[PDB]
């Protein structure tokens, strides 16, 4: 499924080139700009464990998730991945534990050393 597709096909967007955050663009955005670090970003997401099991989606609550880009308010993979996105873009990210919840995980939903999948839509972004 999607998580296995990005493991097999995803672009490595670390920095360290450690395959810790892999990306596929699924829908191309409509703007040419990404958000800048510090920008307020508004996203919809659907998260799955590596094996396809859904753990959460903002669409259920019909409530965009908001954060300040690149400020450590969310797991590392999101700060890195959302920074690569254009407004209106939908991407898939696959995130190794080092760029997510690590050895502790976030039980009950997320086990230790979990590689997580996200489908993320960048709805909007605003200045700092």
From Swiss-Prot:
Cellular localisation: Cytoplasm; Nucleus
Induction annotation: By androgen.
Post-translational modification: Acetylation impairs ability to promote interaction between Akt/AKT1 and PHLPP1. Deacetylation by SIRT7 promotes interaction between Akt/AKT1 and PHLPP1, leading to suppress Akt/AKT1 activation.
Outcome of swapping residue 16 to R: Decreased acetylation; promotes interaction with AKT1 and PHLPP1
Tissue specificity note: Widely expressed, enriched in testis compared to other tissues.
Domain PPIase FKBP-type: 30-118
Residues modified to N6-acetyllysine: 16
Function description: Immunophilin protein with PPIase and co-chaperone activities. Component of unligated steroid receptors heterocomplexes through interaction with heat-shock protein 90 (HSP90). Plays a role in the intracellular trafficking of heterooligomeric forms of steroid hormone receptors maintaining the complex into the cytoplasm when unliganded. Acts as a regulator of Akt/AKT1 activity by promoting the interaction between Akt/AKT1 and PHLPP1, thereby enhancing dephosphorylation and subsequent activation of Akt/AKT1.
Binding partners and assembly: Part of a heteromultimeric cytoplasmic complex with HSP90AA1, HSPA1A/HSPA1B and steroid receptors. Upon ligand binding dissociates from the complex and FKBP4 takes its place. Interacts with functionally mature heterooligomeric progesterone receptor complexes along with HSP90 and TEBP. Interacts with NR3C1. Interacts with Akt/AKT1 and PHLPP1; enhancing dephosphorylation and subsequent activation of Akt/AKT1. Interacts with IFI44L; this interaction modulates the kinase activity of IKBKB and IKBKE. Interacts with IKBKB and IKBKE.
Designated name of the protein: Peptidyl-prolyl cis-trans isomerase FKBP5
Species this protein is from: Homo sapiens (Human)
Region of the whole protein represented: 16 to 140 of 457
């Amino acid at each position: 499924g999607a998580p296995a597709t990005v493991a097999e096909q995803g672009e490595d967007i670390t920095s360290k080139k450690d395959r810790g955050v892999l990306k596929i663009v699924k829908r191309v955005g409509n703007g040419e700009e990404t958000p800048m670090i510090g920008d307020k970003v508004y996203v919809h997401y659907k998260g799955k464990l590596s094996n396809g099991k859904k753990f959460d989606s903002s669409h259920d609550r019909n409530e965009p998730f908001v954060f300040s880009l690149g400020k450590g308010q969310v797991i590392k993979a999101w700060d890195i991945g959302v920074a690569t996105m254009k407004k209106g873009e939908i991407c898939h990210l696959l995130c190794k534990p080092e760029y997510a919840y690590g050895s502790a995980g976030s039980l009950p939903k997320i086990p230790s050393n979990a590689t997580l999948f996200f489908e993320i839509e960048l709805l909007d972004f605003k200045g700092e």
